[model samples]
Target: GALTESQAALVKSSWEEFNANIPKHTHRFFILVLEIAPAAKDLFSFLKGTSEVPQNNPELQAHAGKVFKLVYEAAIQLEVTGVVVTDATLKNLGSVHVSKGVADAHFPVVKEAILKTIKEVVGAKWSEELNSAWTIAYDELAIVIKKEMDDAA
Candidate 1:
């Protein structure tokens, strides 16, 4: 209700970025490694339990330490040095749209800023595969943020 029609379109597009990124990541991460979803709640429960240590009462320190150690070990075992998903691209895009819309006088710069953030966040792994969906989503976000700003203005 708050956003104009155009603004609403943009947010829908941004959400698509996440939609596209998730499929690839899900396929890669879940190939044969950890079936994480089923055990995810259990894992969280274990961590929470550790966080209830008598001394610290609600100290998540132990849970954090354990998770950190396990994460490192898993990364080593999986040979995953560093990984970023298409979602990062969306975050960059969202930031640009919001910032530019707020400034109210830099549509081109807003677009440029979106590209810059995509480059910075997406890094060298630029792929049409990764980018196609991002382009759509980012465009949508641009319109959405602009409309929101215009309405507020």
Candidate 2:
């Protein structure tokens, strides 16, 4: 549950890597989430590129950002708090997910998608330690949010 400073900085460094190309990478992320959560995709199915896939919304991009940033968001909390998500964020996230009809089980699937995508994107920066730490942080997020969802209820 702890991301050592070394592990933590790996996340921040990788986060900045994604931060630089948010739009494109977030698109990759949305499809990955769909592959896992579907929670669903097919937003801009496109009039060109001959209609491959993706949203009915640039709002999909915004939603993608929402999901994508969770990685950085959780990582920073681990770095700063020595635990992952604080009750503050996850508590609010708890009610919001409930309000949006997001099931508690969806949290793991979300991470399944997120961590996998981050791995695929990290290129040469990738390392087993980074993978383990990312998993730790995201897993902690799900644990925290599941607890808070109970609190929210």
Candidate 3:
């Protein structure tokens, strides 16, 4: 099922909390992604010198902020947008991923990383309900993204 009104509210509040610490959360999120899928780091040319730049360097923080913004928008859109718009929005995102050579397989790794990060960041506020809500949100986006990838293939 889609997110209920209460679930949407939960997302909004949690997202606000998440956004307040976007730099730290995004950095942690990417680090987890790198840990789970090391080769994923090769996708970012800017991150090539992360070792020298340090984990929360200006460059890395900016990049992470952008990513989190996209995700934050997606989560909000999933809660607020109509079906047709959501499909188009997600498909456009999918096309961008296709252009970037993001494979269908990559979504799972990212999804896992994101969920883990959300739980870690939210800490005490995290609950099974929130987990279910976010998982549904991610899955909704993944479906469209993968569909675009398949069509492009």
Candidate 4:
């Protein structure tokens, strides 16, 4: 199922707060990803040992910012676009991930990491509804991206 009215409201509002610190939160998400699954670090050349000093490296900062923006853009549009964004936008995204040697398996790590980070940052605002909404949102995107990854294989 998709996001309901309440879920949408929660996600929309919570994201506003979280995204206010895009660079910080996004980097925190990736840090959690690396911590949860160390092998994920191998996927990004720029991520090499830079997780420790994510704020310092120019390259890491640029990449993390771009990643955050992409995620925010996709999340905001998912409600209106209804996963249609996957066909054109995410197909290209999948191709890029594929080129970077990203596998379908890697996506779960990202999902988990993002969920963890968002929950941590959202703090009091976090709720079961928010969790469900974000899970569905991420899973919707992952379904398409993983299909692309599998097809490319």
True-structure lDDT of candidate 2 = 0.70
Q: Please give, for residues 42-111, the per-residue lDDT of candidate 3 as tens digits.
A: 5666667555325657777776666545555555677677331345655566666666657877888888
lDDT of 4 at 33: 81
**Candidate 4: where is the Cα deviation over 4 Å?**
49-53, 65-84
Q: For every model shown, what is its TM-score relative to the native structure?
A: 0.30, 0.76, 0.77, 0.81
**Candidate number with greatest TM-score:** 4
Cα RMSD (angstroms) for every candidate in the order listed: 18.7, 4.4, 3.1, 2.6
Clashes of each: 3, 6, 0, 0
lDDT of 1 by residue, 48-80 (tens): 444222233233334333212222232222223
Query: 35-135 in candidate 4: lDDT tens per residue?
Result: 87877776677767554635555666666566545555555577665553655765666678777877767777888887887788689877787888777
Quickly count the clashes in candidate 2: 6
Estimate the TM-score for candidate 2.
0.76
Residue pairs with backbone overlap in model 2: 43-54, 43-55, 43-56, 44-54, 44-55, 44-56
Which model is ahead, 1 or 4, in terms of TM-score? 4
Identify the runs in model 1 with alpha carbons over 4 angstroms from their true place: 1-105
Q: lDDT of candidate 3?
A: 0.70
lDDT of 2 by residue, 27-46 (tens): 77766766775424332333
Give the lDDT of residue 105 in candidate 2.
66
Q: Per-residue error at 142 for model 4, in Å?
A: 0.8
